[PDB]
């Protein structure tokens, strides 16, 4: 609690799409090493021995992403062998959980300078490749009513009265704001183009974006068909017995995109920044971990946001920018409806519907997205949260410096 945790750098790779994507040929280890080299370029005289850990979120730590990919990034990039390296998995919030853990390690006074972020090469390591204790054990799956995230989003839209046109209207809004952010140059400094071992460009933009999306194009898509396997609808209605039928409104156009990407944030104390000649950009104000019902897994962002607002001593009116991951459109509309979030404050530079949701890295990507927009708008505070599988939730408040 003593030491304040500051963000000195927050960068990410472009997000390459799932089918015939530019980043499919890139190993996820290389996605992190490139970001490490970008930090070295922005700080040529950085004493890397002062870096005590590298914390990466990764939801499928298997194959290309197994064996502590954070430690592999430390060794492969030639970082000092004392610079740590640890992988963590908290499902969709792993990217933000790594930053929060890095901040909390700084606050404990026992760590000075830490790299935090995530990496998820979903084109190479699909979701569920790591198996799962809940999914593959029938006794746990039977007791804990397991249901995919897509069914929870449809249940939210059904209970809240979110029509297919309502969720598609938000999906159109995300494509527009993501296109406007790239056109205005908002992402020019934080999106680090991925290159090969020869320096040749591989990807410099978020190729999942469909900036010419129309209301007519979204209306012609078809609902999701772990889903498309029998049982999950009846299981959800067994707990939500007052709901008669689930309205399946979510498609590939109003849900987050399967993409590859990585993100890296440099967090340290004020003394670590002054000693290394690093200018602070934002201060980690407070973090929170909570959750809601594990069938409606995506209602977790609401109690996690109230929890972090309580700790920081703030209210909704004190936050200039709200950044919630766009796993599904109904989740964001539910979050906006509950906390009365103004529309011009919510996901102002587009979200995962347009740019993609690289599971282990999305939390650090949208965190650095708010570090840039707070600077560009000359605004003060931002709140970043993500829904989680299993019914969890994580929220973080940052303050521009």
């Amino acid at each position: 609690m003593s030491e304040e945790a500051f963000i000195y750098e927050a960068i990410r790779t472009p997000r390459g799409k799932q089918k015939n994507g530019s980043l499919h040929e890139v190993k996820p280890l290389s996605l992190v090493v490139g970001l490490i080299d970008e930090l070295r370029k922005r700080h040529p005289d950085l004493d890397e021995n002062l870096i005590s850990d590298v914390i990466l979120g990764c939801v499928s730590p298997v194959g290309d992403q197994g064996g502590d990919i954070a430690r592999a990034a430390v060794l492969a990039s030639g970082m000092p062998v004392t610079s740590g390296g640890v992988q963590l998995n908290r499902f969709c919030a792993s990217g933000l959980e790594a930053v929060n853990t890095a901040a909390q390690k700084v606050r404990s006074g026992w760590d000075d300078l830490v790299l935090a972020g995530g990496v998820e090469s979903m084109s190479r390591v699909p979701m569920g490749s790591d198996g799962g204790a809940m999914g593959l054990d029938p006794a746990t799956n039977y007791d804990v009513m397991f249901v995919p995230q897509s069914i929870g989003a449809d249940l939210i839209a059904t209970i809240e009265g979110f029509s297919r046109e309502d969720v598609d209207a938000y999906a159109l809004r995300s494509q527009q704001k993501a296109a406007e952010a790239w056109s205005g140059g908002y992402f020019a400094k934080s999106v680090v183009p991925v290159r090969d071992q020869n320096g040749l460009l591989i990807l410099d933009h978020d190729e999942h974006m469909r900036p010419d999306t129309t209301k007519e194009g979204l209306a012609k898509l078809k609902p999701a068909f772990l889903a498309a396997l029998g049982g999950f609808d009846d299981v959800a209605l067994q707990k939500y017995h007052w709901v008669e039928k689930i309205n399946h409104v979510h498609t590939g156009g109003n849900s987050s995109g399967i993409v590859d990407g990585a993100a890296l944030v440099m967090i340290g104390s004020a003394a670590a920044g002054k000693l290394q000649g690093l200018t602070p950009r934002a201060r980690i104000v407070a973090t929170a971990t909570s959750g809601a019902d594990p069938v409606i897994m995506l209602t977790g962002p609401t109690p996690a946001t109230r929890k972090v607002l309580d700790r920081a001593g703030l209210t909704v009116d004190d936050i200039d920018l709200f950044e919630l991951n766009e796993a599904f459109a109904s989740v964001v509309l539910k979050f906006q409806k509950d906390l009365n979030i103004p529309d011009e404050k919510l996901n102002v530079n587009g979200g995962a519907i347009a740019m993609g949701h690289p599971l282990g890295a999305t939390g650090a990507m949208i965190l650095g997205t708010m570090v840039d927009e707070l600077e560009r708008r000359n605004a003060r505070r931002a709140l970043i949260t993500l829904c989680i599988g299993g019914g969890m939730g994580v929220a973080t408040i940052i303050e521009r410096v």
Binding site: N141, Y142, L226, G231, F232, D234, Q238, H241, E244
Partner: protein
Amino acid sequence: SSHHHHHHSMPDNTIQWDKDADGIVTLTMDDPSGSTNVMNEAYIESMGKAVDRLVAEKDSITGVVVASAKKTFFAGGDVKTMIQARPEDAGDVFNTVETIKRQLRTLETLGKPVVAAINGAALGGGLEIALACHHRIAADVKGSQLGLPEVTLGLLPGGGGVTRTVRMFGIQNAFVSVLAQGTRFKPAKAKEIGLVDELVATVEELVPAAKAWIKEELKANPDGAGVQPWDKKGYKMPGGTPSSPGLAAILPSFPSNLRKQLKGAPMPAPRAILAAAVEGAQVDFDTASRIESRYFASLVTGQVAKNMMQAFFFDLQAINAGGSRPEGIGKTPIKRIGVLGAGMMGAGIAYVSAKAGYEVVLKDVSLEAAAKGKGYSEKLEAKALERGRTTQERSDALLARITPTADAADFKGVDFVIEAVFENQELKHKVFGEIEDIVEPNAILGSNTSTLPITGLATGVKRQEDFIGIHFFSPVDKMPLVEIIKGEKTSDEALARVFDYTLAIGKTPIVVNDSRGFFTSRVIGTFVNEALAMLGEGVEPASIEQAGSQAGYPAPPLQLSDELNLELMHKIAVATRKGVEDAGGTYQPHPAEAVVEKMIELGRSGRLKGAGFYEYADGKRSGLWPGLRETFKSGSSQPPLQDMIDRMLFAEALETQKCLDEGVLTSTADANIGSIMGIGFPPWTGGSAQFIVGYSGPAGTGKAAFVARARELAAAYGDRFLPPESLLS
């Protein structure tokens, strides 16, 4: 570490030993204390000695043949012991099935071929013994069945049935086809799915064919002889193991699909079978077998298995043994049956009587309608001939026994009368009175009525001693229960003669004394009325249907309320109101009657009109009526779902005890099987009467906890939940 139950410090011997000149040991199972071979304590010691001897003489043994001297190969386990297993006996139950399976595992890894000579029914532990063998030959004799039906008793195949069937067929096929529902298979279908390898025509060929297979297996497959596919170096489980990427992509959907087919009912046996199957497929065979043991003990010591073992084993035996049959009555064979009424019921009644081999004279008004009931019985044969079950020799003999007619004098020589004419007492009197003197004086005069008391109907004939109620359920050709109703004038001989008829057609009888609503129609009425009351109180209809499905019923109550006409339930209310008002008492209306009359007021009488609690389109039931929530202001009353469940289950359980107190029923076994087979009471309860002695909730387990929970419901929802004094002290 032992093939025996005790290894410190004198049962029967049930296995003979025959070793021929070629070193083939023939283990012939023959329990001297019964006609059925069973996995009792005597078998465990007998098989424990033989397996000890198989190992000690292995240098002189070339093959093993498992056979049986009884008509059946082997049938089930020791249910009288499993029902007494308390939770603190879990270690004893665990050690018992481990000893049984260590025997089979040694027989399976003997390094020699082992063949099962399946001469008859191989059920439960019987098939598990044959599954331990390397080759299964079965005689295609009639009456023989094979399967693992211990899920029907609340148990699981704990003698290797789960482990071995998963090794043979994979997780998905073994669960769906064999384990989850305990399906019984005729020898031809047992060979089709793979439970049986060879078929022979008679039992005489079995042992010689098994020995011939052993002699042939040793010559052609010497290194693989006596080695199961899963004990080989390159074994690959069908469909893959849980680590396989193809199975892991669909594996998380197995519990959710099972939760769909079970509709959320608290039946723990299928859950444990799926758990033991998947967890077993993750490890070696021996570890998988021990995991199977722990799940087996978890079911045996639970209350749900003690409910099902009481209902589907003990209660069913007591009924089939004649517990409600009058004492000391001889059998009176049936020469020619005569059915008065060719409608939906009389068609099936004439079919199930002809399928059993009885000459049936079917009468109706016109010969047109007299053959429309027979046309019902050709629709079932033309579908049983397409499914390749029966023969054209049997089917042409069946339909020949059904004689359609409109001549009342054609009832000459008819000694059994089953009437299915419409619910009109003057009509039943008319149809009977025009037939009593043409049929024999020795003839039974039965009525299929569901509401009209047998006492009043019997006064239309002279031999009221021969008048009785023979109440089938629709459809007749599938529903197993026959509710035999004893009128005031009904003789014990007539009751026993109909009891013999019910068993002769392959159905299960219960004896009921004459009363309003009898037993089935009366008890199920409290179930549908309890749900309509909840709808009027303001409970969401989707929650009410969810409560009925998660309680274990086959159909939710509002849906069932549409099948039974709402103006039919309203008539039963007016009929019962006149009965109480004529007696002088004041008729207190059930809170559901205001819901019935409100729905009838809106012209939504149910499925026949196409409008009820559900909407209907092209004969297919659509969703729930959207105007239903505005009518009854649903959503304003949100009690816990477990209260809705208990309100329906307790309503029927209390009404069952009232039936027992009033003498409507004679035994608890007739109440349990009557409620299970008759009205669809959830099988996990073991019947509406077992539900009292087996209730389990936060209050506890037993009759007292039932009384406490019933009063907890009574103070919250109405005095109808207050228990009768017979359940108190």
